[PDB]
Ligand SMILES: *C/C=C(C)/C=C/C=C(C)/C=C/C1=C(C)CCCC1(C)C
């Protein structure tokens with residue numbers, strides 16, 4: 001398994017991040033700041049365990065489609081299922097979202113990952129992209145509410161940069177999935193795991209640092 | 215698969231509903247009303263994806279019991295797992311339920327569907343109905359709190375009609391399950407899928423319209 | 429299956445407990461007390477169904493490792509997944525925890541059980557204990573926040589006794605798991621199920637009585 005290197009590296013970098021975030025957040029008294037620490041640390045924390053699962057090989061399954069027996073890292077969708085709403089919750093709390101928009105974002109987020117999962121396990125190669133289409137659609141709703149649903153200059157300036165980090169990173173995920181072993185098999189799993197590793201550490205630890213250092 | 219027609223029809227009607235609900239809820243400023251839009255749209259939204267899963271065939275499994283190899287649409291319990299608490303949350307928010315009754319309803323609701331799931335996958339034909347019995351019991355607790363746990367005339371009148379819609383529809387589900395391919399095999403899967411389709415679109419889009427138009 | 433006796437006994441004692449708790453909590457008007465009733469009753473309620481699942485045999489799977497085909501009661505982790513955060517939520521609400529510490533405890537709790545699950549299903553005997561190590565680590569964070577994150581004398585005195593009940597009981601779980609069929613196979617499944625049964629009824633009904641009678 002050639003991509004083991006990017007899984008091992010992902011695991012460690014989610015580890016280093018969880019821990020640094022834990023440290024940095026030793027001391028916080030502020031109820032609000034604690035919240036931002038609870039979320040931000042949990043995210044790579046969970047990401048760590050799941051990257052570990054793929055590295056050790058636990059979160060890895062084969063799906064028969066398109067004549068091949070395709071190895072699919074399911075553990076990603078286990079990761080993403082909890083870490084993605086949490087990321088949205090960082091922005092939501094930041095921007096003082098009404099519970100109405102929180103539920104919407106969280107609800108739409110669950111759909112996104114859920115369809116992504118079903119898509120990933122789909123045995124009929126063509127249906128894979130129907131679920132891709134549904135999932136992407138859900139994605140556009142998030143980016144929608146992020147832009148057009150969502151102010152002290154402190155939160156605003158922090159919001160706009162974290163908002164921007166989200167739009168660009170999350171937009172890359174489907175492309176990878178589409179191009180990768182889940183979709184077209186245009187890029188090998190090796191390159192795909194690398195791209196997903198760059199993205200995840202950027203979308204979590206990267207995103208994380210920007211936040212908790214604000 | 216003869217019931218494909220009722221799955222296809224279900225899918226479309228959950229689609230038309232999600233979308234109409236999305237539209238209708240373009241504009242809402244009110245924090246409370248947004249909440250009611252978040253929930254009400256999410257419900258058939260999720261229902262859509264799951265009806266799609268059964269139509270495409272993804273949410274369909276065989277369970278060996280009673281000498282046969284029974285096709286069980288598991289995806290229903292995936293649907294119901296999230297859509298049912300949300301329905302209860304519409305009524306709860308409507309009626310200003312204390313968090314105590316919210317947790318109770320949600321908690322009891324999880325049990326209901328969870329036992330329903332286990333029941334559906336049970337390999338010993340007789341145990342199927344033990345889990346049916348547990349699930350139904352949970353159901354009676356919901357209908358209990360709905361009646362005897364739960365006032366501006368606006369919410370009350372809306373509550374009593376939505377409360378009534380719930381009691382009658384949800385009471386039908388076990389009967390179908392008992393009579394259907396999950397339980398007795400008195401009715402064929404075809405008729406059962408139809409009944410479940412009539413119920414779901416009624417319990418979601420039907421229920422939905424009454425609510426958001428109030 | 430020799431441990432059937434401890435599963436049957438567990439089932440009944442979670443049953444007797446759910447029901448007594450239901451009764452005892454007929455009448456509560458207080459919003460806060462209701463909360464404490466919602467949680468405390470839900471816990472053995474869920475525990476009941478899951479103990480039933482292992483008794484009937486539904487929540488039982490074989491995992492190939494260390495040359496054997498080890499029967500693993502997975503249903504425990506289904507139980508623990510919801511009942512453990514609820515227990516933490518009893519203490520949290522009791523002690524008026526900020527949402528920051530609630531999320532942290534709940535988040536860390538999910539990790540604990542999740543890794544425990546993965547560990548339990550791990551096919552490489554040695555990795556089992558890596559996940560054991562991760563899970564335990566998560567545990568120490570809970571006991572940490574319980575001691576050093578967490579006052580009318582009423583809640584305090586109740587908190588310190590329930591806090592103590594938690595530390596001692598929950599500390600036993602890994603030891604059992606380590607010694608038992610999940611880990612070392614030092615103790616037979618029979619003895620292990622007994623120990624887990626003593627613990628669960630103590631950590632739930634036992635813990636429960638102390639709380640709702642306060
Ligand atoms: C920490 C992990 C993050 C931020 C992951 C985000 C992943 C997505 C936004 C992926 C969404 C997907 C689609 C839009 C299409 C179908 C495939 C999914 C999972 C990749």
Ligand SMILES: *C/C=C(C)/C=C/C=C(C)/C=C/C1=C(C)CCCC1(C)C
Nearest residue numbers: 297330349350353384387388391417
């Ligand atoms: C949108 C979907 C809804 C409102 C579904 C509701 C389903 C139930 C209330 C079903 C409960 C069940 C029992 C009471 C017994 C065992 C079988 C279950 C799932 C059908």
Ligand SMILES: *C/C=C(C)/C=C/C=C(C)/C=C/C1=C(C)CCCC1(C)C
Nearest residue numbers: 511544563564567598601602605631
């Ligand atoms: C009602 C059930 C309760 C309170 C169960 C608590 C279980 C734990 C605290 C177990 C944690 C585990 C570890 C610390 C190591 C790996 C095995 C797990 C599940 C046993």
